[PDB]
Amino acid sequence: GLFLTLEGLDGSGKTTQARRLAAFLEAQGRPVLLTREPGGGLPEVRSLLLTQELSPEAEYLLFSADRAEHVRKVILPGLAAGKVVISDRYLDSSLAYQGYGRGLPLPWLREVAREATRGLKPRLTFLLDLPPEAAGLEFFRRVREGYLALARAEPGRFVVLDATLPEEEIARAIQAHLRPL
Amino acid sequence: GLFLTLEGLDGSGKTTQARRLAAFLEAQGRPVLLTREPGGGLPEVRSLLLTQELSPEAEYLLFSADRAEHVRKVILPGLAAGKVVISDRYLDSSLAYQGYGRGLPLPWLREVAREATRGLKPRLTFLLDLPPEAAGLGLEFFRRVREGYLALARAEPGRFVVLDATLPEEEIARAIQAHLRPLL
Numbered sequence: 001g002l003f004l005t006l007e008g009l010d011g012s013g014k015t016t017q018a019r020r021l022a023a024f025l026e027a028q029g030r031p032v033l034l035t036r037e038p039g040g041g042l043p044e045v046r047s048l049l050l051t052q053e054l055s056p057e058a059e060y061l062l063f064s065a066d067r068a069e070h071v072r073k074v075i076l077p078g079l080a081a082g083k084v085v086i087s088d089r090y091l092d093s094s095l096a097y098q099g100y101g102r103g104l105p106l107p108w109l110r111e112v113a114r115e116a117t118r119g120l121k122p123r124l125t126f127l128l129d130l131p132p133e134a135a136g137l138e139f140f141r142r143v144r145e146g147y148l149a150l151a152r153a154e155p156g157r158f159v160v161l162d163a164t165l166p167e168e169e170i171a172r173a174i175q176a177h178l179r180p181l
Numbered sequence: 182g183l184f185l186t187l188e189g190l191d192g193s194g195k196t197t198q199a200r201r202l203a204a205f206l207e208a209q210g211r212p213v214l215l216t217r218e219p220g221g222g223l224p225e226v227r228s229l230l231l232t233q234e235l236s237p238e239a240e241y242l243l244f245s246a247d248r249a250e251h252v253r254k255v256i257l258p259g260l261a262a263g264k265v266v267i268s269d270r271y272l273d274s275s276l277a278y279q280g281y282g283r284g285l286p287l288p289w290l291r292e293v294a295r296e297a298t299r300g301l302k303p304r305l306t307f308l309l310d311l312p313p314e315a316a317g318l319g320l321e322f323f324r325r326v327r328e329g330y331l332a333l334a335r336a337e338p339g340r341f342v343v344l345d346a347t348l349p350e351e352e353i354a355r356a357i358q359a360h361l362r363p364l365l
C-alpha cells in the first residue's frame with residue numbers, strides 16, 4: 001500500500017486536490033481509499049470539537065482519539081489490503097492548528113501521536129499553501145506559517161504547493177511527484 | 182483548596198462515599214464541590230463511552246479530553262475559590278482500566294496526562310477495594326483492574342488510602358474521616 005495526505009487551511013483547495021488525486025490513481029488501475037480527518041475514525045468527534053471555549057489540550061486530545069480510531073480501523077487495514085490510502089488531513093493538521101496556532105508544545109503533541117498513530121507517517125504530504133486572509137487572522141497566520149515550518153523540517157515528505165495557482169496546475173504537480181511511486 | 186479523589190470498581194461504594202465525604206465536609210462548614218468522571222468536563226464523552234466500541238487508545242484519549250476540560254473548567258476553578266473538591270474518579274481510573282485492564286503502556290498514559298491534568302494530583306485518593314464479584318470469563322478484565330488499582334496504591338502509599346469496600350457504609354465513612362482529619 002501507499003499512504004498519502006493532503007494538508008492546508010480550510011479553503012486552500014486541499015479537499016479538491018484529495019478527490020482529484022483519488023480519481024487519477026483509480027484511473028491508473030490502483031485501488032484507492034479516500035478518507036478525511038476529523039471524523040474518519042470517530043464521526044461523533046466533529047460534535048465535541050465545536051464545544052464552546054474548549055481548551056487547546058482537550059481539542060488536541062479529541063482529534064487524537066479520532067485519529068487513533070482512524071489509523072487502526074480505516075487506514076492501516078486499507079494499506080494492508082494494498083490500497084493507496086489518501087487522507088484529507090492527518091497529524092500535521094493538529095501540529096499546525098493546535099501546536100503553532102493554539103500554542104501547545106510540539107513534543108507533547110508528537111508523544112501523544114506516537115501511540116495514537118502507531119508511528120504511521122504518509123510517504124508524501126501535499127501542502128496547499130494559502131495566504132491566511134483567503135481562509136482570527138492572527139491565528140490563521142500562525143497556522144499557515146506552522147505548516148511551512150513542518151514542511152521545512154520534513155522536506156522528504158512534504159511537497160509545498162502554491163494554493164493560488166489554478167486547480168488543474170496544482171493537480172498536475174501532484175501527479176508529477178507521484179508518478180515515480 | 183484541597184483536592185480529594187475516590188476510586189474503585191463500579192459498585193464498590195465509591196459514589197456513596199464521595200457523597201458522605203462531601204456531607205462530612207459541609208457539616209464542618211467547609212465549602213465543597215463534588216464532581217465525577219467521566220462527563221464532568223465533556224458530557225458527550227460519557228455518552229459515547231457508553232455506546233461505542235473503540236480501540237483502547239481512542240477510549241483513553243476521549244477520557245483524557247474529558248479530563249482536560251474537567252480539570253480546567255471545574256476542578257481548578259473550585260480549588261482557586263478555596264473549596265475542597267472531591268472527584269468520583271480521576272486519572273487513576275484511566276490507569277487501572279485502560280492501562281492495567283486494556284493493556285496500554287502506563288508511561289505513555291502518564292505523559293498524555295501530564296498536560297491534560299496540568300500536573301494536578303489529589304492530596305488523598307480513597308480506593309474502595311473489593312473483588313469484582315463483590316461489586317466467569319468477563320471477571321478477568323475486572324480482576325486486572327482491581328489488581329491495577331492495588332498496584333497504583335502500593336506505589337504511592339502517601340497518596341492512597343485503601344479501604345475494604347465490603348465493610349458497612351458507616352464504618353467506611355468513619356475510616357475516611359479519620360484519614361482526612363489531619364488535613365484539618
Ligand SMILES: [Cl-]
Pocket residue numbers: 009010011012013014015016
Ligand atoms: Cl480545502
Ligand SMILES: [Cl-]
Pocket residue numbers: 190191192193194195196197
Ligand atoms: Cl460505586
Ligand SMILES: [Cs+]
Pocket residue numbers: 155156157158159
Ligand atoms: Cs518531497
Ligand SMILES: [Cs+]
Pocket residue numbers: 013163164165166167
Ligand atoms: Cs486555486
Ligand SMILES: [Cs+]
Pocket residue numbers: 244245248272275293294297298
Ligand atoms: Cs489523562
Ligand SMILES: [Cs+]
Pocket residue numbers: 299300301
Ligand atoms: Cs503545573
Ligand SMILES: [Cs+]
Pocket residue numbers: 338339340341342
Ligand atoms: Cs495515606
Ligand SMILES: [Cs+]
Pocket residue numbers: 194346347348349350
Ligand atoms: Cs458496603
